[PDB]
Scaffold this active site. Structure first.
Site, PDB file in Angstrom:
ATOM      1  N   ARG D  45       1.546   0.096 -70.575  1.00 42.60           N
ATOM      2  CA  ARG D  45       2.473   0.286 -69.478  1.00 42.60           C
ATOM      3  C   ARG D  45       2.057  -0.617 -68.334  1.00 42.60           C
ATOM      4  O   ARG D  45       1.019  -0.393 -67.711  1.00 42.60           O
ATOM      5  CB  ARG D  45       2.497   1.746 -69.038  1.00 42.60           C
ATOM      6  CG  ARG D  45       3.697   2.133 -68.215  1.00 42.60           C
ATOM      7  CD  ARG D  45       4.127   3.553 -68.519  1.00 42.60           C
ATOM      8  NE  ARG D  45       3.688   4.459 -67.468  1.00 42.60           N
ATOM      9  CZ  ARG D  45       4.468   4.897 -66.489  1.00 42.60           C
ATOM     10  NH1 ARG D  45       5.731   4.532 -66.444  1.00 42.60           N
ATOM     11  NH2 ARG D  45       3.983   5.708 -65.563  1.00 42.60           N
ATOM     12  N   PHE D  50       3.521  -1.903 -59.177  1.00 41.37           N
ATOM     13  CA  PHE D  50       3.138  -0.503 -59.313  1.00 41.37           C
ATOM     14  C   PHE D  50       1.745  -0.274 -59.880  1.00 41.37           C
ATOM     15  O   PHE D  50       0.888   0.305 -59.210  1.00 41.37           O
ATOM     16  CB  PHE D  50       4.158   0.212 -60.190  1.00 41.37           C
ATOM     17  CG  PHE D  50       4.379   1.636 -59.821  1.00 41.37           C
ATOM     18  CD1 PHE D  50       3.483   2.604 -60.203  1.00 41.37           C
ATOM     19  CD2 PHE D  50       5.500   2.013 -59.116  1.00 41.37           C
ATOM     20  CE1 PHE D  50       3.682   3.903 -59.890  1.00 41.37           C
ATOM     21  CE2 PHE D  50       5.700   3.329 -58.789  1.00 41.37           C
ATOM     22  CZ  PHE D  50       4.783   4.270 -59.186  1.00 41.37           C
ATOM     23  N   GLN D  53      -1.165   0.373 -66.520  1.00 40.74           N
ATOM     24  CA  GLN D  53      -1.762   1.473 -67.258  1.00 40.74           C
ATOM     25  C   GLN D  53      -2.424   0.966 -68.524  1.00 40.74           C
ATOM     26  O   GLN D  53      -1.949   0.026 -69.160  1.00 40.74           O
ATOM     27  CB  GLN D  53      -0.707   2.510 -67.616  1.00 40.74           C
ATOM     28  CG  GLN D  53      -1.246   3.755 -68.246  1.00 40.74           C
ATOM     29  CD  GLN D  53      -0.240   4.867 -68.267  1.00 40.74           C
ATOM     30  OE1 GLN D  53       0.882   4.710 -67.812  1.00 40.74           O
ATOM     31  NE2 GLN D  53      -0.635   6.001 -68.813  1.00 40.74           N
ATOM     32  N   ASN D  92      -2.778  11.014 -65.197  1.00 40.71           N
ATOM     33  CA  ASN D  92      -2.636  12.404 -65.594  1.00 40.71           C
ATOM     34  C   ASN D  92      -1.159  12.734 -65.744  1.00 40.71           C
ATOM     35  O   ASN D  92      -0.294  12.090 -65.149  1.00 40.71           O
ATOM     36  CB  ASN D  92      -3.304  13.352 -64.590  1.00 40.71           C
ATOM     37  CG  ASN D  92      -2.910  13.063 -63.150  1.00 40.71           C
ATOM     38  OD1 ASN D  92      -1.825  12.561 -62.873  1.00 40.71           O
ATOM     39  ND2 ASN D  92      -3.807  13.376 -62.224  1.00 40.71           N
ATOM     40  N   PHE D 103      -5.131   3.465 -64.845  1.00 42.40           N
ATOM     41  CA  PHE D 103      -4.280   2.395 -64.370  1.00 42.40           C
ATOM     42  C   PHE D 103      -4.945   1.707 -63.192  1.00 42.40           C
ATOM     43  O   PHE D 103      -5.501   2.361 -62.302  1.00 42.40           O
ATOM     44  CB  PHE D 103      -2.884   2.898 -63.983  1.00 42.40           C
ATOM     45  CG  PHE D 103      -2.868   3.873 -62.846  1.00 42.40           C
ATOM     46  CD1 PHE D 103      -3.032   5.215 -63.075  1.00 42.40           C
ATOM     47  CD2 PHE D 103      -2.661   3.447 -61.554  1.00 42.40           C
ATOM     48  CE1 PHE D 103      -3.014   6.102 -62.038  1.00 42.40           C
ATOM     49  CE2 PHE D 103      -2.646   4.338 -60.516  1.00 42.40           C
ATOM     50  CZ  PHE D 103      -2.819   5.662 -60.756  1.00 42.40           C
ATOM     51  N   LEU D 112       1.129   8.381 -54.975  1.00 45.73           N
ATOM     52  CA  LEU D 112       0.208   8.931 -55.958  1.00 45.73           C
ATOM     53  C   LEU D 112      -0.995   9.615 -55.328  1.00 45.73           C
ATOM     54  O   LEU D 112      -1.788  10.218 -56.052  1.00 45.73           O
ATOM     55  CB  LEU D 112      -0.284   7.844 -56.914  1.00 45.73           C
ATOM     56  CG  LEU D 112       0.689   6.833 -57.525  1.00 45.73           C
ATOM     57  CD1 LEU D 112      -0.051   5.995 -58.545  1.00 45.73           C
ATOM     58  CD2 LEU D 112       1.883   7.499 -58.169  1.00 45.73           C
ATOM     59  N   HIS D 116      -3.417  11.597 -58.688  1.00 46.64           N
ATOM     60  CA  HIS D 116      -4.109  10.741 -59.641  1.00 46.64           C
ATOM     61  C   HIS D 116      -5.500  10.409 -59.127  1.00 46.64           C
ATOM     62  O   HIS D 116      -5.639   9.770 -58.080  1.00 46.64           O
ATOM     63  CB  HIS D 116      -3.319   9.457 -59.869  1.00 46.64           C
ATOM     64  CG  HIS D 116      -2.016   9.669 -60.563  1.00 46.64           C
ATOM     65  ND1 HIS D 116      -1.914   9.782 -61.931  1.00 46.64           N
ATOM     66  CD2 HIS D 116      -0.761   9.804 -60.077  1.00 46.64           C
ATOM     67  CE1 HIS D 116      -0.649   9.964 -62.261  1.00 46.64           C
ATOM     68  NE2 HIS D 116       0.071   9.988 -61.153  1.00 46.64           N
TER      69      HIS D 116
END
Lengths: 88, 131, 35, 155, 318, 210
Positions: D45, D50, D53, D92, D103, D112, D116
């Site tokens: 990902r 952003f 991941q 998570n 990530f 976030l 996270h």
């Protein structure tokens, strides 16, 4: 014989997951395998249609019409999701 | 690297073909004709099956005092001293280990008898509670 | 490696079986406590 | 505890592992790098602006194992806030459900903070992360050219 | 590839059964587990093989309205179909002929259950609030009990003397038929704890447990052992759904009593582990409300029927 | 010759204060044991005499060695390389013996210095190689150890998993046996109702005669 054992086993290969995109399920797995969500930061915005998820439905025809006219005419009807009632 | 029976690097290196065990040439010939079997397991073996693994061992390095006829034979002396000084101690270790094994076996037999008895105790206890 | 471990295991066996015994004893004891 | 290394098909970059603000998570990443776990292990990902991941060996993105045998709990602080690029945090599926998946952030992601667990930051090779965020991805944010983690290990 | 422990002999672990032209309201596996009786809203019964083709080798017609509930008879060659056209019908399976059509009910014959040990006798509970017991060889109904509220789900007990009926009246009743040879008997047991209608009733493979699905979106497990606590309620299951459709959503026990499967209105096939009372399988794939789920007699195979004119037929892996 | 007389040890932990109890039980088990030998090696195979009846060599070797009285080091007094003493000086055959020892030790030291010069000239990389081989045997042995440790650990883990797969089913079987017990107590109160129903029947015959 109790000498020492670990909890490393029963994980790894057995937990069979599907690709985070695939919209079919080829085998009947338990709920924790097949389900149990993907991961990661919500993201900023995998769906079916473009602006949401379009899914086939099948009812008997009384039910569409009855609910469509309990809300339609009366203002207040049943949510098609099965979650309570809608409106005032 | 060592012949399993020997324990130090063979100077006439030979594996048997049938086995997977590398052997001393003279020794394992004597042993194949001495019982008829593979001394690693007891498998039946014959003397030609031996394979002459020879890649010219000649590496055994003269040490400092051992580099001498007087030295080489003096270490020959304490060497045979030590070879028997190990074998006899293994004889008595066999004896005491064997004795320990016998004691353990007797203890195990006693434990089995007690488990057999205590099981009758529990089985009758439960059959009684069933009333 | 058989024997010593096996006697440990037999101690375990009779431990399990005596716990089973006293468990059935407590069962009958509650039984006759009732009546 | 300092300086774990990721070397990927796009490059190699190195992250420190924060000791104090999150000991469980950092120990997890340390040891999982040590055991050869993050090898292969494609960045599945990647979303521009952003995050990047990674960490799921299965390539699905659904689950990556831990050293504790499953999930474990977050270490959110009012101290550790996703403030810029390069921040390394755990992924998570909600509260207290971390696995192995992590990530690297490519941007400031406030939204976030509180969900996270951060445990580090990229000390060396931010060029690789910049190049790695801009890689071509499909409609699922999956890199169309697999971005393998060819080897991860502490240093 | 993926090689996950093929359980059954089916060609694939998930098989969809198509050919119906209406909602599929109830289904049933043959006692010898190699037939499917599927009863649709299209007032027709498809007979499928469970193996080697899944061939619908016969479509039996003869009801004039939706065939709401189907069981097989204890030997597997005779079928009991119950409908909305006020007519329950006994058919011969191998043949394609109807044997005995009894239509004594005044309204839709919602529920039926044929007795599994004893004679060829089946209960049927319909919209007239009357639960009637029907022996095969007489042409009159052998028994007729009258509740006050339309009967939704009925079952015949393992042992063969009592009848369980549950409906819109918020309480399921157990009645004794030998205790009643009169026309206004009063109910023997009142299992309460559902908060609205009951839709499906299954007798446990040992006969001590009765499963009730309720539009209380709750599966409840009661014990029918004549020596019980004051509250016969044992178990509760959450997870499935009932909606405005108010379809006849049923129960089933795995052939071992180890799982319990419910049909739901959220199109999901639910399979709980009875012991931990929690959700083992939540299988998707149905486009309409899942009407009834049936566990294959021998293997752990689960087959579901939906209001989407198809039937998924597959095996469970874990 | 018992077959798998075992209660699972990863499930069934031996208690702390059950070590003394199980100890005393094993002790009284011993007390009246059937054929208490503690020399039961009699049934163990005969540990045989050291097989050199065809070499007197190792015969006398063992006969002394078990007494551990060592062989003397070889001829140190001759090694000091001395000519005939006072009572041996005059006789020349003693100087023949001296020829023997003196010439022998002369060439001893000569071929000695030859071997030493030969290695310090040549031997260096030979020792390089043989110490490399000792390190190779070292690391191969520890590799064998890590392997054996690994496979054995895997087997142990499998055993633990099997133990877990059983102890749960055993525990639940026993708890449902206890529920079967309470079910029996239920049917005991059923027997109560049997007595009560017969006592109730002890009124119909009364009215019947009345």
């Amino acid at each position: 014989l109790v000498l020492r054992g670990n909890e490393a086993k029963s994980l790894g290969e057995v937990r069979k997951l599907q690709d985070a995109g695939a919209r079919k399920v080829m085998y009947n797995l338990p709920v924790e395998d097949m389900h149990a969500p993907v991961l990661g930061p919500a993201h900023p915005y995998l769906k079916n249609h473009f602006v949401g998820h379009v899914e086939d439905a099948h009812m008997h025809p009384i039910h569409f019409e009855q609910q469509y006219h309990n809300f339609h005419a009366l203002g207040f009807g049943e949510a098609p999701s099965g979650i309570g009632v809608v409106g005032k | 690297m060592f012949c399993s029976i020997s324990g130090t690097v063979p100077e006439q290196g030979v594996v048997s073909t049938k086995s997977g065990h590398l052997f001393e040439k003279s020794l394992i010939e004597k042993y194949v004709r001495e019982t008829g079997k593979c001394p690693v397991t007891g498998e039946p073996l014959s003397t030609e099956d031996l394979l002459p693994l020879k890649v010219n061992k000649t590496v055994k390095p003269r040490t400092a005092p051992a580099t001498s006829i007087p030295g080489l034979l003096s270490l020959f002396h304490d060497e045979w001293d030590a070879n028997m000084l190990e074998l006899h101690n293994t004889r008595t270790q066999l004896h005491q280990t064997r004795q320990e094994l016998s004691h353990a076996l007797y203890q195990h037999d006693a434990a089995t008898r007690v488990i057999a008895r205590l099981l009758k105790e529990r089985d009758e206890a439960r059959a009684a509670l069933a009333d | 490696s058989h024997a010593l471990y096996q006697h440990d295991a037999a101690t375990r066996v009779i431990a399990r079986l005596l716990k089973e015994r006293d468990e059935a004893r407590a069962a009958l004891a509650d039984m006759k406590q009732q009546y | 505890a300092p300086l774990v290394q990721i070397d990927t098909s796009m490059g190699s970059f190195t992250v420190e592992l924060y000791y104090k603000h999150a000991p469980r998570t950092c120990k997890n990443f340390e040891e999982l790098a040590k055991k050869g776990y993050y090898d292969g292990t494609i960045f599945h990902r990647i979303i521009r602006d952003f995050m990047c991941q990674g960490g799921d060996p299965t390539g699905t993105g659904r689950g990556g194992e831990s050293i504790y045998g499953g999930k474990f709990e977050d270490e959110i602080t009012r101290d550790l806030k996703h403030t810029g690029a390069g921040i390394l945090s755990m992924a998570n599926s909600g509260p207290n459900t971390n696995g192995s998946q992590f990530f690297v952030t490519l941007a400031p992601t406030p939204w976030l903070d509180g969900k996270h667990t951060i445990f580090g930051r990229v000390t060396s090779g931010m060029a690789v992360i910049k190049r790695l965020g801009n890689v071509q991805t499909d409609n699922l944010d999956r890199p169309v050219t697999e971005v393998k983690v060819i080897r991860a290990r502490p240093v | 590839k993926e090689g996950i422990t093929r359980t059954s002999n089916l060609s694939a672990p998930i098989i969809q059964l198509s050919g119906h032209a209406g909602e599929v309201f109830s289904m049933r596996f043959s006692p010898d587990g190699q037939c499917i009786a599927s009863g649709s809203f299209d007032k027709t019964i498809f007979l499928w093989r469970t193996y080697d083709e899944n061939e619908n080798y016969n479509v039996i017609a003869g009801h004039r309205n939706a065939v709401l509930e189907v069981h097989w008879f204890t030997d597997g060659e005779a079928l009991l179909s119950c409908s909305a056209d006020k007519t329950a019908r006994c058919w011969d399976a191998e043949t394609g002929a109807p044997i005995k059509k009894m239509g004594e009910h005044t309204a839709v014959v919602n529920s039926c259950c044929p007795l599994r040990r004893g004679a060829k006798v089946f209960v049927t509970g319909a919209d007239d609030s009357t639960v009637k017991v029907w022996d095969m060889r007489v042409k009159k109904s052998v028994h007729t009990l009258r509740s006050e509220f339309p009967v939704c789900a009925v079952a015949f007990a393992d042992a063969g003397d009592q009848v369980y009926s549950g409906g819109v009246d918020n309480a399921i009743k157990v009645w004794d038929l030998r205790r009643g040879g009169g026309a206004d008997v009063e109910p023997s047991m009142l299992l309460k704890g559902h908060s609205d209608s009951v839709t499906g009733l299954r007798v446990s493979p040992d006969g001590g447990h009765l499963l009730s699905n309720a539009m209380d979106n709750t599966l409840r497990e009661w014990d029918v052992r004549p020596y019980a606590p004051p509250n016969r309620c044992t178990k509760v299951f959450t997870g499935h759904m009932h909606n405005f459709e108010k379809n006849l959503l049923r129960c089933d026990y795995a052939a071992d009593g180890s799982k319990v499967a419910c049909g739901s209105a959220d199109r999901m096939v639910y399979i709980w582990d009875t012991s931990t009372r929690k959700l083992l399988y939540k299988l998707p794939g149905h486009s309409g409300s899942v009407n009834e789920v049936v566990f294959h007699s021998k293997e752990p195979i689960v087959a579901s029927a939906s209001s989407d004119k198809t039937i998924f037929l597959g095996e469970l892996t874990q | 010759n018992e077959h798998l007389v075992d209660a699972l040890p990863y499930v069934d932990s031996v208690p702390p204060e059950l070590k003394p109890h199980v100890e005393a039980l094993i002790e009284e088990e011993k007390r009246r044991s059937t054929k208490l030998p503690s020399d039961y090696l009699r049934e163990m195979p005969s540990v045989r005499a050291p097989k050199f009846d065809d070499h007197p060599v190792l015969k006398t070797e063992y006969e002394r060695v078990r007494n551990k009285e060592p062989m003397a080091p070889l001829d140190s007094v001759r090694y000091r390389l001395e000519p005939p003493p006072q009572a041996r000086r005059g006789d020349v055959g003693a100087w023949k013996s001296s020829l023997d020892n003196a010439a022998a030790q002369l060439e001893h030291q000569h071929l000695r210095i030859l071997n030493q010069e030969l290695l310090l000239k040549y031997g260096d990389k030979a020792w390089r190689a043989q110490v490399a081989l000792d390190e190779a045997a070292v690391r191969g042995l520890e590799a064998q150890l890590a392997a054996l440790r690994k496979e054995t650990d895997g087997l142990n883990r499998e055993r633990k998993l099997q133990q877990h797969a059983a102890g749960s089913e055993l525990s639940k079987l026993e708890r449902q046996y206890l529920s079967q017990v309470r079910k029996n107590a239920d049917i005991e109160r059923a027997c109560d109702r049997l007595e009560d129903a017969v006592a109730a029947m002890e009124a119909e015959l009364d009215t019947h005669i009345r």
